[PDB]
Structure formats: C-alpha cells, structure tokens
Ligand binder design. Structure first.
Ligand SMILES: NC(=O)C1=CN([C@@H]2O[C@H](COP(=O)(O)OP(=O)(O)OC[C@H]3O[C@@H](n4cnc5c(N)ncnc54)[C@H](OP(=O)(O)O)[C@@H]3O)[C@@H](O)[C@H]2O)C=CC1
Ligand SMILES: NC(=O)C1=CN([C@@H]2O[C@H](COP(=O)(O)OP(=O)(O)OC[C@H]3O[C@@H](n4cnc5c(N)ncnc54)[C@H](OP(=O)(O)O)[C@@H]3O)[C@@H](O)[C@H]2O)C=CC1
Ligand SMILES: COc1cc([C@H]2OC[C@H]3[C@@H]2CO[C@@H]3c2ccc(O)c(OC)c2)ccc1O
Ligand SMILES: COc1cc([C@H]2OC[C@H]3[C@@H]2CO[C@@H]3c2ccc(O)c(OC)c2)ccc1O
Lengths: 312, 312
C-alpha cells in the first residue's frame, strides 16, 4: 500500500545522470530513462542504457527535437529529473531543457521536476563574469520557465563534486592528486563544501518525492565534508605520510591573463574564484529543514578521507 | 612456479581497451594500464582507471608526447597490448602507435606486442577506397614498423563486434534493432562473422602469451556466429515472435551519393560494403591452428541469440 513514484531520468547516461538512475532504482522508484535517437552509434551511451534495463529500468524513446515524443514520455511518470550537461569543457546544453519544460507543462501529470542544478545555486551568482556566468544565467532561465509554467520543483544545490575538487586536491586540469607540490588558492583557509557525486545522486532520489522539499531549494552540506583546501590537503598528507610543498596563489595571480585563456578554462577559473576566493558555498547559513544530510540522515555520506584512499 | 606474464594495456579506457584490461585481470596476468596526462579532466576515463586499480591493476603514468616515459612504461612489462582508436566517427589515431613501437624497440624487453587490430585484416584490404582505406593503410604502417623493429607480435582479426553489427541487425546509424522494418544488404545471404566485444577481449588475454600464436595472425571465427544477415534477422524474429518487413538494398543503391556523405559515413559505407556485399570476412579459409575458438575452446563465446535478448 502507498503511493507509487514513477521517475523519468532525462540525461541518464551522463556523469551524474547515470548515478541518479542507479540511486532511483535503489530507492525503489519505478525508474524510466529517456533513450534519445541522437545517441546514434555511441556504444558507451547505448550500453549504459542497456545496463539500466538489466537492473529493472524502463527505456523510453524520445527526442528533444520531437515535442510530442517528450510529452508522451513525461505522461508515463510522476517525477522528471533532468541531468542535462552544464560544463564548458564537456557540453553546456542547459537551455535545451526549455523544450522539456514545455512538454511537462502540456502533459499536466508531472508532480515534480528537478532540473539540472547540482552545483552552485545559480540564483546567488548574478555577479559572475562571462563565460562562467552562462552556467548560472542558463539555469535561471530554466527556473523562470518552471515558475511561468507552474511546475512544482526541487532545486538541489550547494556542493562541489569530489571528482572535480576533492580527489585532485582542487588542482586544475587533472583529476589525480599531485605527488610533490600543490597550489593553494589564497591562504587555503576558506571553507568549501565537498560531496561524493554518488551521494549527490542518493539525495536526488531521496528528495524527489519528499513533501518537505516541494518547491524548495535543498542545500547539500555534509558536515564532515565542509573543509578548507588546507584541510583537504592535510587529509591527503596523512594518508600518504608525506608533506606537500605548498605555493600560495594570490587572487590577482590566479586570474592573470584570463582573457587569453580558452573559454572552458576561463569558465573554470571563474567558478574556482567564487568557490575558493569568495567562499561562495559557505558564506550563507542554511537551516536544518533545507539541508540534505539533516533531511536524509540515513544516507551515510562518503567522507573525503575515504574518497581519497584509492588514489594513494 | 612458472613464467610470470606482465601486460601493459595502452588504451585501457577505450571501448575494447577496458574489456582487455578486465580480461587480462581475469586470466591472471599482472596487469598494468597506461595513465596518460592528456586524459585531463575526463571523469569517465579517470574513474575507469581507478576501477581497474581497485581490481588489482597497476596504473603507469606516461604520455605519447614523452618518448622516455613510454620507454619507462614498457620496461615494466613483458607484453604490450594497444587498443588505440580506429573508428572515423570516434577518433582514428592508429598512427600514434608508431611512437609506442619506437619505445618498445628501444626498451628491448618486450616479448610480444599486439597492436590495435581487432577487425578486418588490413593486409587483405588493399583494394579499399578512401576514406575507409585509412583504417587499413594506417594499420599496415604499424605492421611495417613492427617488422622493421623486429618486435614479436600477434594480430587478432576477422570478426565484427556484436555491438556495431549484431545487436542492431546491422542497421547503420543506431545500435538498437528496428521494430518493424529492416534494410537487408543485397540478398542478405552473405556470411558475416560476429563476436561479442567481450569475447574479443577474452581471446586477446588468452593469445598474448600463447607460443602457438607467436608472430601469427589469429582469426576470430566462432562457428555459431558465422551468420548471414538474414540468419541474424531470423534470430531476432524468433525472439520477438514478429516478422520484420524487409527491403533489399542493391550495391548500387547502397553506395549512391557516397561522395556527398560525411567522411565518417563514407568510411562506414565502405566497411559495410566489404563485409556484406563482398563477404570479406568469409571469402577465405583459415586453419584450426590459427582460429581463436579452436585455439581457446574453453572460452564459451556468447551466441547472438543471447546477445540480442536484452533488446527485446
Ligand atoms: N562540482 C559540481 O557540483 C558539478 C556540477 N555539475 C552540474 O551537473 C549537471 C550534469 O553535468 P554532467 O553530469 O557533467 O553532464 P554530462 O556532460 O555528462 O551530460 C549529461 C547529459 O546531457 C544530455 N545532453 C547533452 N547535450 C544534449 C542535447 N543537445 N540534447 C539532449 N540532451 C543532451 C545527455 O543525455 P543522454 O544521456 O540522454 O545522452 C548527457 O548524457 C550540470 O548541471 C552541471 O552544471 C557538473 C559537474 C560538477
Ligand atoms: N566490429 C569491429 O571489429 C570493430 C573494430 N574496432 C577496432 O578496435 C580498435 C579500438 O577501437 P575502439 O575501442 O573503438 O577505440 P576508442 O575510440 O575507444 O579509443 C581507444 C583508445 O585510444 C586512445 N587514444 C585515442 N587517441 C589517442 C591519442 N591521440 N593519443 C593517445 N591515445 C589515444 C585512448 O586511450 P586512453 O584510454 O589511454 O585514453 C582511447 O581510450 C581499433 O583498431 C578499431 O579499428 C573498433 C570498432 C568495431
Ligand atoms: C561547484 O559548482 C559547480 C561546479 C562545476 C564544475 O564542474 C567541472 C568544472 C566546473 C567548474 O570548474 C570545474 C573545472 C574546470 C576546469 C578545470 O581545469 C577543472 O579541473 C579540475 C575543473 C560546474 C557547475 C557548478 O555549479
Ligand atoms: C569489422 O571490422 C571493422 C569494423 C569497424 C567498425 O567499427 C564501427 C564502424 C566501423 C565500420 O562500420 C561501423 C559503423 C559505421 C557507421 C555506422 O553508421 C554504423 O552504424 C552501426 C557502424 C572498424 C574497423 C574494422 O576493421
């Protein structure tokens, strides 16, 4: 007995998307994944979808170029979760979600939509410079379309994926931690929020039918993972029994020559500046009633000493 | 007691490469995987490498742009297996292997090199037209460099990956089988050789220290998977209890307008022409002493009715 929750994951072969599919299956949701014809001859995408089908997910054919196919897909479910791309060095197709919003509005049966958020809260980032500002402006365009359409929502925000900021000791251009030398942004004593991307997906699956988070922004701030960069580096130094040689990088030097860099690097520099120099993930307080680890305390989130162990 | 085999897989995060890593671990080889700095911020590549490390593989840092780093990597092992890219719609970087050949020659300790073959035997394909001919010409350039350097080798050839030709009933542009209508090349009665890409990797791990295949071409021809396209379609019709509407495509119509197509499609058309119209995978006899399933009869290769089941 009890209400059934059917979930359509749009973006199910993405980095976060594939973890959201797994987490929805594990949570017991009836889990559907969009199978786009445009994935074409991409063997990794196709075989990810088949792997979900083996685990009990339902593949639903549809294309963002075919409005009625999107309407037909979302009519099958109660909740839609979008994990649309939003990283300049990957692809950055956040605005394609406008077509999904229009399909949800027409279908009328969707109880909640979670758009592709899962990072810095775009509503706090009006000051950002281009091209990094595209991430926040495009995500706000989706939020505005959600509001105009009257679609119920949850926005899950507020943490750095450990893959991109934690396992590499926040060194740009690599996802492996350095062996001898490390660049520290500023004095390294600005608190950053880290979360295992797997746990971001677990909180997605927990929150998407939680009445407490209807039409709310939910902040992901795992207490033990609120760490300065120096604290993160010290976790690694303990695991490896070795001190790294530290270079402290001023804000002025961090941003030097930014106009001459590749677009995706300019975006990265801007995001890193907000996180590590401005402390944008920790410069505001949030209540327990809107923070993921307090709402879902049964998720035993991965701490960064555990995340880092496989790298040593 | 007995000789230890250390294997370096170069290309370990590739479609075939990741399966070769898995198969080498399963075979009991001491398994090393090249970790290139150029993989950069690619989370899927990095996390594949870490997944191998969790299973007991050894990550070895090196770059094709750093000759001495390649020499140092290959000095650690007895056998090198390259799964370098070679598909126009993915990347086609076969010639980068020349740098690996030079490093192997200098190192001097490598007992065998398996270059990135794993498809049509390039030595049989001199007649191919550009741009598809690039695949065969570039692979022959590697073979010629191997011979000039005196490096011992095995060339594993002769079968279509089920992912690209079997699970889709050989329909171009998709990896899913069609629901109602199917295009048949010619009369559909030309034998093609199909192999699960997983089993191509198993035969790689079996053959790379087999004295019987030293300096040999080894053909992968699983008897139950030597199928015409009509036979493949009939397997699917049986699984789905439904007949597909067949359109028979002449060679002339298959190649029509080829000069106006995108390069990667022109390459695909050429390869499909050799396989399905010329029967290039079955127009020559091979001996049991050079055929993978007879050499390694303990590999219970996947048949195409099993491969197709997850699609219905
Ligand atoms: N540290 C942090 O907090 C981070 C936050 N993020 C945020 O996470 C979210 C997801 O990012 P990520 O996982 O990297 O996304 P990916 O780059 O993996 O792309 C996700 C999905 O987007 C779909 N997609 C891309 N282009 C199109 C298109 N033109 N039309 C239709 N679908 C398309 C695809 O779906 P399909 O599977 O159907 O092919 C793809 O798998 C973003 O909002 C991002 O900003 C991401 C990185 C780090
Ligand atoms: N039906 C059949 O028989 C088929 C046969 N094949 C053949 O299989 C082989 C592998 O193909 P596939 O698995 O699709 O390959 P992928 O496209 O997956 O690429 C394999 C690896 O190539 C490496 N690579 C690519 N570019 C470079 C570069 N510039 N420098 C260094 N390394 C690079 C990468 O290694 P890293 O992991 O280190 O990043 C990558 O993971 C090819 O020879 C292909 O022709 C492939 C398709 C079907
Ligand atoms: C933390 O919030 C976000 C993070 C991100 C990050 O995903 C990966 C990118 C982007 C910001 O900086 C990351 C990055 C960019 C360039 C690099 O060289 C890099 O190296 C690790 C890492 C995107 C959107 C967000 O709201
Ligand atoms: C079978 O031998 C090979 C096959 C291949 C194939 O890998 C994928 C490509 C290429 C030939 O045709 C495949 C392909 C190309 C275009 C398509 O639209 C397609 O759809 C399934 C499939 C490459 C090298 C080979 O020696």
């Amino acid at each position: 007995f009890g209400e059934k929750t059917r979930v359509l994951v749009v973006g199910g072969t993405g980095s976060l998307g594939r973890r959201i599919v797994s987490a929805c299956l594990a949570e017991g949701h009836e889990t559907y994944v969009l199978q786009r014809p445009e994935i074409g001859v991409d063997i990794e995408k196709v075989q990810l979808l088949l792997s979900f089908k083996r685990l009990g997910a339902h593949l639903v054919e549809g294309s963002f170029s075919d409005h009625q196919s999107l309407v037909s897909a979302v009519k099958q479910v109660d909740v839609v979760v979008s994990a649309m791309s939003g990283v300049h060095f990957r692809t950055h197709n956040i605005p394609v979600q406008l077509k999904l919003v229009a399909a949800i509005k027409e279908a009328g049966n969707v109880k909640r939509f979670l758009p592709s958020e899962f990072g810095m809260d775009p509503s706090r980032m009006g000051h950002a410079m281009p091209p990094g500002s595209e991430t926040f402006d495009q995500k706000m365009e989706i939020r505005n379309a959600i509001k105009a359409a009257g679609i119920s929502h949850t926005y899950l925000v507020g943490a750095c994926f450990a893959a991109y900021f934690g396992g590499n000791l926040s060194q740009m251009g690599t996802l492996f931690p350095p062996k001898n030398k490390v660049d520290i942004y500023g004095d390294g004593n600005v608190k950053v929020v880290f979360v295992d991307e797997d746990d971001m997906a677990k909180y997605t699956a927990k929150t998407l039918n939680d009445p407490r988070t209807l039409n709310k922004t939910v902040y992901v701030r795992p207490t033990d993972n609120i760490l300065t960069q120096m604290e993160l580096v010290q976790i690694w130094e303990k695991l490896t029994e070795k001190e790294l040689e530290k270079t402290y990088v001023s804000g002025n030097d961090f941003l030097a020559d930014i106009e001459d860099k590749e677009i995706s690097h300019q975006a990265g520099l801007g995001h890193f500046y907000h996180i590590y120099y401005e402390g944008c993930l920790t410069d505001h307080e949030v209540g327990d009633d809107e923070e993921a680890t307090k709402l879902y305390p049964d998720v035993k989130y991965k701490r960064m000493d555990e995340y880092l162990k496989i790298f040593v």
